[PDB]
Structure formats: structure tokens, C-alpha cells
Nucleic acid binder design. Sequence first.
RNA 1: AGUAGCUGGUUCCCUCCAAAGUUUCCCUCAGGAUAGCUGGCGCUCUCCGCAGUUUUAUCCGGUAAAGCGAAUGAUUAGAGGUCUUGGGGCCGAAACGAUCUCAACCUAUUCUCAAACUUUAAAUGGGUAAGAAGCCCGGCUCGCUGGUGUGGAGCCGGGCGUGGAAUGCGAGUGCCUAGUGGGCCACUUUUGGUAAGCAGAACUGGCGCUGCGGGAUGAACCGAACGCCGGGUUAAGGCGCC
RNA 2: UUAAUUAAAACAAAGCAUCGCGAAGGCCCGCGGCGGGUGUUGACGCGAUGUGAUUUCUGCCCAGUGCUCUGAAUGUCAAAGUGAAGAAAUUCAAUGAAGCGCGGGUAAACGGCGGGAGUAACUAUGACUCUCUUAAGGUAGCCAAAUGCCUCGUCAUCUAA
RNA 3: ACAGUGCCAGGUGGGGAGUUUGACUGGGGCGGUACACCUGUCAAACGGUAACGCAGGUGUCCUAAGGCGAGCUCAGGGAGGACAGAAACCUCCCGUGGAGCAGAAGGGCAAAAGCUCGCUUGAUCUUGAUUUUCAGUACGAAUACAGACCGUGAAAGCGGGGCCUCACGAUCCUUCUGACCUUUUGGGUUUUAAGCAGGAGGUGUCAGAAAAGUUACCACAGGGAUAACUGGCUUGUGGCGGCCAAGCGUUCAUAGCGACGUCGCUUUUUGAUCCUUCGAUGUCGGCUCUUCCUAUCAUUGUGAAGCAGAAUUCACCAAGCG
RNA 4: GUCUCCGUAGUGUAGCGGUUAUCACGUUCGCCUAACACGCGAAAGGUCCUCGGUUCGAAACCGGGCGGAAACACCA
RNA 5: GUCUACGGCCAUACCACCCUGAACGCGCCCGAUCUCGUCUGAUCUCGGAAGCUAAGCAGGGUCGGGCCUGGUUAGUACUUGGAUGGGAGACCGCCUGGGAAUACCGGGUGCUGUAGGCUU
Lengths: 205, 159, 104, 56
Amino acid sequence: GRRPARCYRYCKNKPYPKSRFCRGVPDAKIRIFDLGRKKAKVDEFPLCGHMVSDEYEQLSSEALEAARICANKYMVKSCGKDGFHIRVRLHPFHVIRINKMLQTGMRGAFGKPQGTVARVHIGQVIMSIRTKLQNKEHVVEALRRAKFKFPGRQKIHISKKWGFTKFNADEFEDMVAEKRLIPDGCGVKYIPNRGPLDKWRALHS
Amino acid sequence: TNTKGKRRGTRYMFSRPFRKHGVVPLATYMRIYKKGDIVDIKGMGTVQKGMPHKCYHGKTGRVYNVTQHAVGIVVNKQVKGKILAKRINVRIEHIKHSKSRDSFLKRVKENDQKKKEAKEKGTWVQLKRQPAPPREAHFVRTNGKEPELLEPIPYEFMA
Amino acid sequence: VNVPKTRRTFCKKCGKHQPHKVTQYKKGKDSLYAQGKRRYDRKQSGYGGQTKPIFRKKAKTTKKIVLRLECVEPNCRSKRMLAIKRCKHFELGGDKKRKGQVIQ
Amino acid sequence: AKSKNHTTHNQSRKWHRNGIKKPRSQRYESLKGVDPKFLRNMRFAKKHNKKGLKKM
RNA sequence: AGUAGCUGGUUCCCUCCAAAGUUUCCCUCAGGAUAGCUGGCGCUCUCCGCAGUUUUAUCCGGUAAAGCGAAUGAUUAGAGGUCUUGGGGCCGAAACGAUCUCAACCUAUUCUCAAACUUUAAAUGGGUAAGAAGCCCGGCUCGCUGGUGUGGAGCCGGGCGUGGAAUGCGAGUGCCUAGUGGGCCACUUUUGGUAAGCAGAACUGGCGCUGCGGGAUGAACCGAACGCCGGGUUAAGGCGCC
RNA sequence: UUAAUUAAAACAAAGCAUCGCGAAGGCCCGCGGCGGGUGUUGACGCGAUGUGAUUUCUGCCCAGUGCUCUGAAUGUCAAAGUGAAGAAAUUCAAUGAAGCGCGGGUAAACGGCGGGAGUAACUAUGACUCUCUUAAGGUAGCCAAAUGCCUCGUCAUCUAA
RNA sequence: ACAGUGCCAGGUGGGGAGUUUGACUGGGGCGGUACACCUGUCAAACGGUAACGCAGGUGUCCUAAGGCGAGCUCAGGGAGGACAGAAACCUCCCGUGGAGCAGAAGGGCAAAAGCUCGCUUGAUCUUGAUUUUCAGUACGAAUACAGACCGUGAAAGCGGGGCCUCACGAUCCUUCUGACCUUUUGGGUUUUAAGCAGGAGGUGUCAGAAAAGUUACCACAGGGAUAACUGGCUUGUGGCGGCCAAGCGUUCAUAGCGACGUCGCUUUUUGAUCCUUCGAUGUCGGCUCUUCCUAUCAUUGUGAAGCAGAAUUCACCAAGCG
RNA sequence: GUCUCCGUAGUGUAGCGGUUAUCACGUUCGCCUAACACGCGAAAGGUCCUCGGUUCGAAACCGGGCGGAAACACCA
RNA sequence: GUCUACGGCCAUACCACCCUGAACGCGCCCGAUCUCGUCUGAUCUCGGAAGCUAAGCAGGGUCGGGCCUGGUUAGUACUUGGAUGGGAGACCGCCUGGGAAUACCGGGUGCUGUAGGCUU
Ligand SMILES: [Mg+2]
Ligand SMILES: [Mg+2]
Ligand SMILES: [Mg+2]
Ligand SMILES: [Mg+2]
Ligand SMILES: [Mg+2]
Ligand SMILES: [Mg+2]
Ligand SMILES: [Mg+2]
Ligand SMILES: [Mg+2]
Ligand SMILES: [Mg+2]
Ligand SMILES: [Mg+2]
Ligand SMILES: [Mg+2]
Ligand SMILES: [Mg+2]
Ligand SMILES: [Mg+2]
Ligand SMILES: [Mg+2]
Ligand SMILES: [Mg+2]
Ligand SMILES: [Mg+2]
Ligand SMILES: [Mg+2]
Ligand SMILES: [Mg+2]
Ligand SMILES: [Mg+2]
Ligand SMILES: [Mg+2]
Ligand SMILES: [Mg+2]
Ligand SMILES: [Mg+2]
Ligand SMILES: [Mg+2]
Ligand SMILES: [Mg+2]
Ligand SMILES: [Mg+2]
Ligand SMILES: [Mg+2]
Ligand SMILES: [Mg+2]
Ligand SMILES: [Mg+2]
Ligand SMILES: [Mg+2]
Ligand SMILES: [Mg+2]
Ligand SMILES: [Mg+2]
Ligand SMILES: [Mg+2]
Ligand SMILES: [Mg+2]
Ligand SMILES: [Mg+2]
Ligand SMILES: [Mg+2]
Ligand SMILES: [Mg+2]
Ligand SMILES: [Mg+2]
Ligand SMILES: [Mg+2]
Ligand SMILES: [Mg+2]
Ligand SMILES: [Mg+2]
Ligand SMILES: [Mg+2]
Ligand SMILES: [Mg+2]
Ligand SMILES: [Mg+2]
Ligand SMILES: [Mg+2]
Ligand SMILES: [Mg+2]
Ligand SMILES: [Mg+2]
Ligand SMILES: [Mg+2]
Ligand SMILES: [Mg+2]
Ligand SMILES: [Mg+2]
Ligand SMILES: [Zn+2]
């Protein structure tokens, strides 16, 4: 139904968002970016692996949907439906056009919206998985399988940050002990030595 | 093609800076402009009268006429292979005294004094500027501290 | 466009602002003995058919309204033409606008 | 048929063959375009310059 | 000897200089006029001026990047409040009584974005200045301005050469003027298109107009530009044999 | 019948049907006239068209475009003529030929001749009904016809196909 | 006294004459207007910059929506108040503009440029200079002044149209307005006519001819600047083939298949483009004849099956022979 | 494909920027008739296809959709 | 130390809340005969001087929000010029120069001109 993904692999056009100028864009193939036990607290899943893009290219919303299912099914089978949390880190905002031929030719060749893609840079995280530290093997295998749904080269990388947080795993526990970090569900709020001293009193009372 | 509109492409050029809209400070209107002065042209979108044309925004000219509200400026404009001395009428909101010559006038006064003062003291002083010379030989004391050894760091995939 | 039937404007004969009667200008009927109409008649006579262009491709849908001013000074009565912009609807001394009224 | 539409290629090469000469500068510029009221008095100032000739 | 904005042809040598396929207007699109690019003839001076350059000062800017716990727009996930509004429940005599529960809402966070968003904000870039047409004194004219013999401009006389960054270079100026007005290619940037030895732009440089060494071969690549010669040395490329 | 790429289903034809004209006329020629052809003619004739033997039949539409008929009753309407103003040039008014407008006729004149929905006791159709609608809304016939896109329509016959 | 003829006048008059029947354009036509203009973007931080590039607008509207002055403050929200409720009107508070300013958009604007009142006609008369497009021409539009008459305000001041960026038109001709105007030919008076200056009547193909078709009966000058074959680049579409493995296969992913995805190859499909050929490369199909490819239907030699045999399916070397 | 046009009670249809959204049929209630039809007197019932916008007020006017129907598509 | 009138720059000056304000001021404040204007002496205008710093206003405070300014981000991203560099490409590295911005961390919290007062 759609052209082979080699036709829209490269970031050749400027970003083309669905806006008030580009009307008629069909809905993206991927509508869910978080799945698994999304409600696990920050402290339940210390491990985090990433699928990191090694190329500057465009991924179709179809391949994001395909990879998500691929990585999600393998985790449900090797860790259980409540043993992980998957977050797809790319959103298909750039719109790809089509100049449909059956005949004007190249006259009036500007194309109609055909789909959506995510523009991914080198070193940019495609999708992330957080789970328990004893499932590190199953995370790598899930992301290794999902690579086959994407064009180009992607690298797997087990992060040093605690879960989906921005704070290193080697010190995350210490910061929570002294109330520099406050769990707020999947993540942690950061407490600076700033602001009204009342907020400090509340945290220490 | 494009349009020949007078203010095409001035969306940002003539807009006011961030959180600097509103009333125009009155010192803008208290400046004294004299024939021969050098002024930098800068269109201000708050006042739409006497607006300089976009091609003159960011150019520097010379005042030749002074009226109640505006001045006449002789400003070079390049059109293709020739440069034309153009005469524009610009309300004094859209100009400011150029400080490019002030450094020169400061130097002239300093030059003349040194020229005058040194003459009565029978000495030759330098007056002409010079380009920065290569730095002269010098000693670097170590203060009994071995220079810190530097090494390249290992690669890490901090992705 | 709505224009008052009077306006105090400049009179060239008087050299000072004066009240003026305002009316719309209307082209007068063509003279048969104007040099241009006399030359045309002689050229259009005999054989040869039409000799001048006849304009067909009309594009404008309105005209510039010219107001005929007259000085109301009994001694001066000087007149002047005063053209305004294009308008599809033009009237003299129509009902003046009212604000804060219920429109029925 | 269709042809090229516009370009400025080769144009800065032609402009510089005879140099992009700056406008000529004279020590006396024309009073064209200066304020008519101020020019009227300047003419009057010049017109009676000879009145104070002996004093000078 | 009809006219032809169209096809074809247009006859000796050497020397010197040497283009354009671009601007605007045209029933203009296979053509003209126009500016540009060219040539010729000079002339006014010279043995201060100028510059496809940097330096030093000083302005101009909103692209690259970045931002979205900053405005606009788009957008993922949980978390804490919640009666200020609803869906379900749910004990009733029943109410804003009790009870949860899911939603909207609000508050802090969180994922991801913009050619027609932006608080920030480069590099490269554009303008100006770097003196004698300057600086500093005394005076005079005014019908302009005016509390003021104030202001401004103009004019007269006088005094100051360490000619006030680097570098390079002789400059200025005027007539007459042909051809051209189908272009095309490459690095980078860039629009449309799946792409194209595709169509359309910016910058510079090329081919066209140009041979020569290398790329076996080749309009454009790499090196390098050319009077007729000898010797020497090289470039880019090479050194089994051809 | 296209001499020299088309011999035909094309043209003609008898038959049929219109139309103009009674001679100072119809139709036509001619630069010209007491000019000329039809015409040495006279409506069973001459002139202008369509269809195309016979057989059978030739339905509806005059709104459109044509053609035609009636006209001071009568809007517009040239020159010339008439009247008034003026020094005159000139201007103005009154009057009002044909033709156009107005009203009839005419299709063997050019031509034209619908759409939607519901409805019969299985289903299907739908004689029947409702509705919008035009100047008529395609009648008798005929048809995948030299005329039907879909289409190599569907059924039957002709073949092993 | 009409026919008729001579000369004028009105109608009819493709019977006949002459002529026209735009341009751009991924060939032309059809379609659009990228033909005169304006906003944002493209556009690569001065300016400029193309495409039948993208998102839009214009041929108007306004006696006030122009001008001045004064006085106010808007969208939205919160909380209160008979009927009154989501929504009527009153009150208090918050409110950087989240409103409004004729319109497209962008910019600008808070004791205002918005809203409401009061007075008004600077939308008037006039000579030059300048800017924008630019050839440094015209128009159009705009900017500073200058000279008169004015309005408004207590006044400073502001105003010669609309907050800024668009909203428009030469020559010739016609019409109007102006002067104790010039000429009206030998002089004078007077009608007329012509001059001079400023408006309007319009050219939207918008620097401005007056303009319908058809040609298969066709013609000339050209064009490979340009379409209809081949060939060339490309390969979207077509064809063929891999990779991952959710499923299918009773069981069992992979004997045989294979979704969601993804990577390729081919030029026996169609496109896209217009490089060669228009002083001509004979345009479909069949027939005949040779040759070549392999992506193998058969045959030879093989491997694997959900291969008992038979039949079949998948795969290998393989184009010798059909 | 380009261009033009159309969506209103159950059906077919009017609407001349401010309507009690027109007409006919249909449905319902009551008379009439032994009953039916015809007929007479009444009643009800429009998601103005949908979203946005101008307007003091949009069924209408202007745009974006959702379905529908015409006209073209030629020279090889 | 500080205020009043008029200002320049226009948040280091703003916003929220709390504390403190001698003197003179600036105010709140008391009235409507006159001037003037309102549905309303609320505002505006006019005539005053019983009271009060309650508020405005001034100074200060807040591990305050904002704002200003540094650090980090980082010689990172981006970039001028170069190569017969790599790679099928996408892109990337190096040579020669220039060189950012968040988050995060710190510091600051109006200066000042003219005139005239108060403060032994
Ligand atoms: Mg592109
Ligand atoms: Mg005649
Ligand atoms: Mg050209
Ligand atoms: Mg000849
Ligand atoms: Mg000849
Ligand atoms: Mg030609
Ligand atoms: Mg023309
Ligand atoms: Mg040629
Ligand atoms: Mg820009
Ligand atoms: Mg960016
Ligand atoms: Mg090209
Ligand atoms: Mg050539
Ligand atoms: Mg050359
Ligand atoms: Mg060469
Ligand atoms: Mg080679
Ligand atoms: Mg040699
Ligand atoms: Mg023959
Ligand atoms: Mg024959
Ligand atoms: Mg007939
Ligand atoms: Mg018949
Ligand atoms: Mg008829
Ligand atoms: Mg028919
Ligand atoms: Mg029938
Ligand atoms: Mg038959
Ligand atoms: Mg048959
Ligand atoms: Mg005729
Ligand atoms: Mg003819
Ligand atoms: Mg053409
Ligand atoms: Mg640039
Ligand atoms: Mg005001
Ligand atoms: Mg004036
Ligand atoms: Mg206004
Ligand atoms: Mg006489
Ligand atoms: Mg034919
Ligand atoms: Mg033909
Ligand atoms: Mg060609
Ligand atoms: Mg082809
Ligand atoms: Mg394919
Ligand atoms: Mg199974
Ligand atoms: Mg080409
Ligand atoms: Mg040949
Ligand atoms: Mg041959
Ligand atoms: Mg041949
Ligand atoms: Mg094989
Ligand atoms: Mg006290
Ligand atoms: Mg009071
Ligand atoms: Mg207090
Ligand atoms: Mg703070
Ligand atoms: Mg302070
Ligand atoms: Zn008068």
C-alpha cells in the first residue's frame, strides 16, 4: 500500500510537521509509546537499556509500531507482563508527501501527505526499557530483536542512570536517603537547596 | 518570484526587542544632530513615520540636512556593480550617533597633546598605531612544581 | 461612501476657507464641433470602414467620484473638481452613522 | 519551450572587472535638498557679508 | 530583386586587446530596446590617491545550533490535590450525609518536536572610521532660531606636518562602440520529485572561448594555463611488460 | 463516380412530399440599357428543396432558431420636409418609411422528444400510486443492428474447442 | 403622374471582400494565472535571489473607520447579587494585552494607535527635493520639508486621509473646472473654435492592438529549443529475491508457508525526463530464420519433505536437447 | 485525475441575511359510512449533511470535510 | 540618614507576604458656598485642617518567584578555509581558524541629574 521504506529513509527535506499549513495528514501508525508496568515506582526498575541510533535517518511510524510490538512481546514472555516498562522515545512528527502518478507529469508536483516519520540523529535513543537488574539479559535480547524492524545501524547500550531518571545509578540511592530526590511515581523530583525554608521543613517533618 | 512590497522580509528587523516594547525613551528625542555627523540607521517599528527602507537598516551615513523631526543622511548603497550615495530622510527615532569616529576623535586629541607636549620637551614619541607584534621572549617560572601531565581520556558510550 | 452636501474647504478665488455646496460631477454631452469630433467625422466618412479603435476589453467595475464644489459666497460662486477614491455605492448627505443603537 | 528564469551567476565577476568604484567625494557638496527656510537665510547671510568688510 | 523576428553561405597574412547567455520594458518567450560585460580614440595629472585583503575601533542581523520543567503551536507518561463539575457505583427516609471509584480540572514533574514558533544565539558576512576636505584660535553676515551677543549656518584672517594601522599598487576622466542577451558543469548550501545524466536557486570556480601532463578512453576531474628553442627541476600522477 | 491508390453501402433514379410564381411575375445572369436565360414558355408550367422503387406506416413538440402573415392600434426609428429661440452658425421641439419590438400560423422547416420514491399474501417484478418537472418528455416499430462504453453483454444454435 | 430612372438616407445582406482569432506552460491542447499587486516562508542572521514552490490575500471599505482633544481600559477568570438558569443586568478582585485596531498575514500599539464622548473637514490650495520598483525612466505608493488657508486643544503641539506594509492606469480623443488669460491670420465687436493649467471617462494581456472558428483537401519557413519509436539516466509502479520471526502447519516458527516491519536485484511492465534523431533511423501483429540469457517446465546427476509405494512439493550443479 | 454543481420533516420539493423554516403526499386524532374508500374538521413531526469563520443575527454568505451527480480526457 | 517637585536609564527598580517608619514632606482625611463634573462631591473640580500612619509611600526581611550577572554545560554543538581522507551510502574523522544555548551552581536586588526641604 505504501512505498518501500528506502524511498523516505534520508532527512532530505526540512521538518514538515502536521500544522495549520499541512492539513490532511493521516494518523500515525504508532499511538502508544509507553507500555508494560507503567505505574512501577522509580525504585522497582533500576536497570535501563537503550536502542541507540548510529545513523542520521528517518524511521517510519510503521517501523516504530513494529519494533514496539517486537520488543514488548519478548519481554512479556521472558519477564512477565508486570516485569518491565517500555517507552518509545521517538514521535513521528515529520510528514512525508507523495506525488501520485497514474497526466500532468512533473507539473504541479508538490505531493500530498502520505505518512509520518521520526527524524533520529546519531546517538539518539530510539526506545528504552527499564526492569529489574536480574533481567539485564532479557532486555538486551528484546532490543536486539527489535533492531530488525529498523533500517540502518542501531546500538544497544545499558545506561548508567537509574531507570528512566537523569541521575546516575551509583549515587541515586544516596540522594534519596538525604532527600535530594523524592519519588513521584515513575520518576524523581529534585530538591535543591533553594526556595522557601517551609518546603525544607515539610520534607524534614 | 517575490513581491516588491516596501516592508517585505522585515518581520524581525523592525520588531521591537524582547520586553522592550511600549513607550520610546525621550532621550532618543533629545539627541543633537549636526551637519556632518555620522549616524547608524536602525529602523524602529514602534514609529511608522519616517521609517528608513530595509536596505538602509544597519548602514551608517552622514547628516546633511536637519528638519524639525528628521534629518537628511548621505548613505552609500550598492546596487549591482556600482555604489550610489543616496539621500534619505529619516525621523530621528530611527538613527543614533555613530561611535565609530569617536575612537578616532579621541585619538586625534591624544595625538595632538602628545605632539604638542613632546615638542616642548624635545622628545620623539610614537603616534601611529601598530599591529599587535609577536610577543617577546620571557621566562616561565616553574616554582618547583613539575608540569601536570595530561593524557587523552578513554572513549565511553555515554548514550 | 457617504459625503455631506456641504463642506468648509479652501476656495482659490477667495484664497480662504469658505462653505461649499457639494454635488456629483457628470460628464457633459459631446460637442459635434470639437476639433476631435470634427476630425473623426471626416475620417469616418466615405469608404474604409471603422478607422479608429473601439475599446472592448473593459475591466474596471467602478469609477472615481468627482465632487463639484461651488463657493456659496454670492459674489464668487467659483467651482472646483475634487476627486475621491473608487466606490461601488456613493451618496450625498445620507443618514449619518449612529452608535449604540439597536439594529432592527 | 522552457528556459532559465533568473540568475546572478557571473555577475559579481563582471561588476569587478572595472571595480566597484565608490562615489566621488568633493570637499564642497551641493545644497540640493536642504531645508528651504534655512537655505533662504543662508543666502541672506551671504548677501550681506560685504557689510562688515571694513570691520574685518 | 514582394516580405521573412527563420535555414544556409559570407573570400588574404601577422600583431594587440577580448566577451555574453544576466537586469528592466516590450502581443515580450527562436526577436528587439535597455544596463551590464568589450574594443578603440584619447585627454587631465603623477613619478596625494586607490584596494574582490587584513588590523584596530564601532554598529547591523535572527540563519547553524539550542529551547520547550520560557510565550505560540504540537505532544508521551505517570504523581499529588480535588469539590469547582460529571460517569459509575453504594448504605438509604435522604439531603452537599456516608462511601469509594473513574474522569475531567489544578499543581509540581516527565518523553518527544517546528520552513511559514521562540527567551537565547554563532561562524562566515554587510555598513562606517582610521586626519591637512583635519585640529585649534580671533573676527564678521543673517530676513533663520531667540530670555541672553542664545543657537545654527555661512564667510574672513591666523597658527599647527611625527601625511597619524598593515600590506600592495600610479591614478582620474570623457566620447564613440561591436558581439551577447538558448548556456552548461563541480565542492559547499538548497526547493520540488521515489529518483533521474530530472526541473529550479545561492556562492565561488570552471567548460563554453583552451591547448598541455595525469585520470587507459572522456567538454567540466586532478595538476597546470600556451611566443620559437637548449639545459636543469618539478606538479598531479606514476616506476613487472606494453 | 474520385483520368493516375477508394467502383462502394457514395451519386443519380422513378416514386413521395413540401415551397415560390398569373408576367410591371417567380428564379437567375449582367459594369451598362426599352439589356439577357427559363421562354418557340403559362400552373398537367417554370423555378427551389428534402426523401429515395414497391409494401406498411410516418407518433408528440411552435418554448428556441428560422420562415411567414396583420398592422397607425403602435414603443424605437434616418434623411428630407414643418415649427420655435437666436445676429447667424446652431440648438430645440413636433411628426414618425421600412426594419426591429408586439400578436397569429407553421416541423415531409432546422431541430427536440425527463428524474426520484413506494406498491400484488414466499421471492422477483411491479399493472397501481405519490412527487419534482418540461415546448413535447421517444409513440408504432427496431436493436450489442454499419448505431451498446461496460462488452469477448446473457440464453440458445453452429465446433472437439 | 404612378411604374421607372438619377442622387441621397435607414434596414437587411457569409451571396461576396479583407482581416483577426494573446502569452506563460516539464510538447501542445484542456486545466490553472505563477500576466498588475500585497503578507509569511523558501532565502543559506545586510540587501538581492528561481520553479505551474508552499500557506494566504487584492481590484474593495470608511462623513467616519479621516483630524484634534479629553476621559477611560481590553480578552479571560474568580467570588457575590430577586425572578436569573451555561448564557441577560449590578458589585468587588485578578488580569502584559492572552482583546481591539474594516480586510490577508506579519509588525506596532495600554492615562494608547483600542473604546466612549465633544468640536470638526490637514481627504483643502501650491512649488520643488527625496524614498521604494529602478534603467537609478514612468506610473503607483510613500518620506521629510517649504509657502497659504484652516481644524483642534488651555497649551506644547498634532493633522495636508485611514497605525505600517497592497488596494491601481500613458499618448491621442472627449468632458468639467480656472483667468478682466493667449490665439481665432487685413483691422474691429460678438458667437464659435483652438491654446495653457488641474480633475474625470481606460486600457485587469494592468509601460496601455480594435478581433470567432475549422481543415483528414491543406501550404510555406523552420525546430531535435518541442511531442509521437528505439536507445540513455531513474525505478515510483510492475517483476523477482533476501532478512527478523507473531502466527499457520493437530503437536512443532522456519518440511512447506509466513503477518507487522525491513534490505535489495531486474529493465521482458508502465511511468517520470526530453539527452540523440524532424534537408525523415519506414510506425502494430503475424510469417520466416539464427543466435543468446536463466529468474529451470521437461530430461541427466543430486540434497530435503508433514518422501511407505505411486504421485507430488522445496532446493543444488545445470541452458546440452526440447 | 481536472472542472461544475447538489445534500432541508418518512418521500418528492420551495426558501426575495431578520419566517411560527413553503407545497403535495405520507402518519396520527375525530366526524361521515353497517364498514371501506372518497370527503369534512384538527394535530404532530425538519440533527436545514458535518466542523470552523464573517455578521448585531447564517439554513443561506466564505473556507475545511463527509457522501452524491454531471462535463471532459484529444494529435500521435 | 532621608524626603518632595520634575526627570534620565527603564525589574539589580517588578510581584507576593511580613516588620519598622524621628522631623519635614507626600498622603489618607473633613466638607460642597463658590469653579467644575457626576445616577452617585465615589472619581474629577473647588474650600479646608478634627484625626491617623491603618493604607499608599520609604527602608528592611524571605535557604521567596522574577529579573541582572557570573560558573558549568564546553572547547561540547555549530562553523570559515583544505585534502586523489574514510565509508556502498547515511554520514564521520582529521588539518587550519572562530566558537554557542538549556538544565544544574553561585552572587546581586536600583543607580543617578536639577531645584527645594527635614534631620545638633
Ligand atoms: Mg527535498
Ligand atoms: Mg457614407
Ligand atoms: Mg534567457
Ligand atoms: Mg535580396
Ligand atoms: Mg524572391
Ligand atoms: Mg522569432
Ligand atoms: Mg502591448
Ligand atoms: Mg536556431
Ligand atoms: Mg528569516
Ligand atoms: Mg533547528
Ligand atoms: Mg541543473
Ligand atoms: Mg556559442
Ligand atoms: Mg575566459
Ligand atoms: Mg583549461
Ligand atoms: Mg579510469
Ligand atoms: Mg625542458
Ligand atoms: Mg482513382
Ligand atoms: Mg479502381
Ligand atoms: Mg424536408
Ligand atoms: Mg414526423
Ligand atoms: Mg417557432
Ligand atoms: Mg435523440
Ligand atoms: Mg420503447
Ligand atoms: Mg435482422
Ligand atoms: Mg445479433
Ligand atoms: Mg455576408
Ligand atoms: Mg470571408
Ligand atoms: Mg503557446
Ligand atoms: Mg545571506
Ligand atoms: Mg487619549
Ligand atoms: Mg504647513
Ligand atoms: Mg483610526
Ligand atoms: Mg473680415
Ligand atoms: Mg474528412
Ligand atoms: Mg487529425
Ligand atoms: Mg532534445
Ligand atoms: Mg520513450
Ligand atoms: Mg517494487
Ligand atoms: Mg502453534
Ligand atoms: Mg535539459
Ligand atoms: Mg539522416
Ligand atoms: Mg534502415
Ligand atoms: Mg533512409
Ligand atoms: Mg541457475
Ligand atoms: Mg510623627
Ligand atoms: Mg470627599
Ligand atoms: Mg504600618
Ligand atoms: Mg531568589
Ligand atoms: Mg531604593
Ligand atoms: Zn469663493
